[PDB]
Amino acid sequence: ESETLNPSARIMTFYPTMEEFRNFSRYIAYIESQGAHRAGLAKVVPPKEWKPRASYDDIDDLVIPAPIQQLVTGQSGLFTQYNIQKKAMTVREFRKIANSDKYCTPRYSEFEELERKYWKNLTFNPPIYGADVNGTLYEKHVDEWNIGRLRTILDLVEKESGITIEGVNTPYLYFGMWKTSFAWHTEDMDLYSINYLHFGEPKSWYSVPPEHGKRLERLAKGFFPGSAQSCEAFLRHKMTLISPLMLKKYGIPFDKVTQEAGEFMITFPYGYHAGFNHGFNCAESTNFATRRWIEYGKQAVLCSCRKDMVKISMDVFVRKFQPERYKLWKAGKDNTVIDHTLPTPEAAEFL
Ligand SMILES: N#Cc1ccc(O)c(-c2cc(C(=O)O)ccn2)c1
Ligand SMILES: [Mn+2]
Ligand SMILES: [Zn+2]
């Protein structure tokens, strides 16, 4: 039973062997079989034997075409992040700024100390995030967990229509510095995501279980009624930051995890997450899908107030994987209800 596995919906950590690590979709289905998805977020530590690139010593020349300065406004654990686009710059130039005294990591003993400082100084001295950089740091030959070519069914989007959506079915790189942030969100079309930390200081994550996502939404709508009235899904703007103390105070279940260089994070459909970087680092990510995602995709509530928001046609997926329901679905009469505790069909061999 779905409900009997990971009943506390806690973030799980997995240490696959090299044999397990080789088939990406298999291991995703496997960790789902262990209830990992119920947390919304999971950590996967790859075998020590494994490395996606021999050396990162060459990248100081790589261009960050649109660095973003992150202005944050708010109080009492509620904040809204405004992006200001800076002029292009190099990893060398970025690293110099990031390690500079003005911008570098404050010192501290335990994580909770660094965490407290993040939520205390969030609004002061705005950092720069080298974000949404198109590209990959994977060497052309690495066949395990290659973010450039995961070969999941998300590939049906490009295959059928030729459409690429930057960062979604293509890779993004993220160059961080201390106190740079990602706001509370689910992925576009409530897909999965994979995030790999190539190098640098840690990246910390908060997550809310999918079975409690709607609860976080009610709370957010209550605290940002203006934004809620203007948009059916304003959290998709990725501007909204909420401190873990505010989540506790209003009884939203959540969990924390800190990601180290060379570690993977997997986010699951309708898994709300947010977080921040500890210092200079580099992360790579993209979205992907499983058969389980399709229903999430069919029902995802999208941003209504922008023309350039990401919308994937679900049609090809329903035809190919839910043929019984296609007619009904197209007639707007498909009332399937989602069970967030259930694992993906592909795990039939591990169920
Ligand atoms: N803006 C934005 C945005 C859109 C989609 C995403 O998955 C993330 C995101 C970014 C990070 C990160 O900046 O490290 C971690 C997790 N999620 C951020
Ligand atoms: Mn994300
Ligand atoms: Zn919107």
Q: Where are the domains of the chain?
A: 11-351
CATH code for the domain defined by 11-351 = 2.60.120.650
Which protein residue has the closest C-alpha to ligand 1 atom 7? 187
Written as six digits, the tokens of 140 are 């052309």
Which residue has the CA at smallest separation from atom 17 of ligand 1?
A: 182
Residues 43, 63: Cα–Cα separation, whole Å? 29
Amino acid identity, position 184: W
Question: Minimal CA–CA distance to 91: which of 186, 217, 209, 176?
Answer: 176
CA distances from 221 to 82, 163, 229, 234 (A): 19, 33, 8, 9
Q: Where are the beta strands (DSSP E) in 236-292?
A: 240-242, 255-259, 264-267, 272-277, 281-288
Name the binding residues: 129, 185, 187, 195, 203, 231, 237-238, 273, 303, 305
Which amino acid is it at 234? Answer: F
The DSSP code for 171 is: -
| Distance, CA of 159 to CA of 232 (rounded, Å) | 30
Resolution of the determined structure in angstroms stands at 2.4
Place of tokens 């395990």: 144
Binding-site residue positions for 2-oxoglutarate: 129, 195, 203, 238
Three-state DSSP at 32 gives helix
Q: Which ligand is nearest to the CA of 230?
A: 3
DSSP 279: S
H or E element in which residue 79 lies: strand 78-85
* CA-based nearest residue to 40, from 187, 151, 260: 187
- Give the count of alpha carbons within 13 A of 286, CB side only: 24
Identity at 192, one-letter amino acid code: Y
- Residues in the ligand 1 pocket, defined by CB under 6 Å: 174, 182, 187, 193, 195, 203, 238, 273, 283
Q: How far is CA 147 from the centre of its chain?
A: 13
Look at ligand 1, atom 13, and give the residue with the nearest C-alpha.
182
Tokens of 17: 């062997």
Six-digit token string for 128: 């720069």
Q: What is d(CA 68, CA 206) in angstroms, rounded to the nearest whole number?
A: 22
Q: Which 3 state secondary structure label does DSSP give 45?
A: coil
Probe target for ligand 1 pocket from 11, 41, 132, 185, with the most ligand atoms within 8 Å of CB? 185
Phi/psi at 94 (5° precision): -60, -50
Residue reference for tokens 């609004």: 123
CA of 267 to the centre of ligand 2 (A): 7
**Parallel, antiparallel or unpaired: strands 192-200 and 264-267:** antiparallel
**Residue 293 exposed, middle or buried by CB count within 10 Å (0-12, 13-18, 19+):** buried
CB atoms within 10 A of CB 185: 18
Residue 291 Cα to ligand 2 midpoint, Å, equals: 20
- As a whole number of angstroms, the distance between CA 266 and CA 57 comes to 27
Q: Which residue's alpha carbon is nearest to atom 8 within ligand 1? A: 182
Catalytic residues: 167, 174, 185, 187, 273, 285
| Whether the Cβ atoms of residue 205 and residue 237 lie closer than 8 Å to each other | no
Kindly give the distance from the C-alpha atom of residue 182 to the centroid of ligand 1, in angstroms, as a whole number: 5
Residue 334 burial by CB count (10 A; 0-12/13-18/19+): exposed, middle or buried? middle
Q: Tell me how far apart the alpha carbons of residues 35 and 5 are, in angstroms, rounded to a whole number.
A: 5
Spatial contact of 286 and 340, defined as CB atoms under 8 Å apart: no
Token code pair at residue 152: 């999941």
Could you identify the residue written with the tokens 């596995």? 5
Beta-bridge partners for 287: 193
Q: 334 alpha carbon to ligand 1 midpoint, in Å?
A: 31
Experimental technique used to determine this entry: X-ray
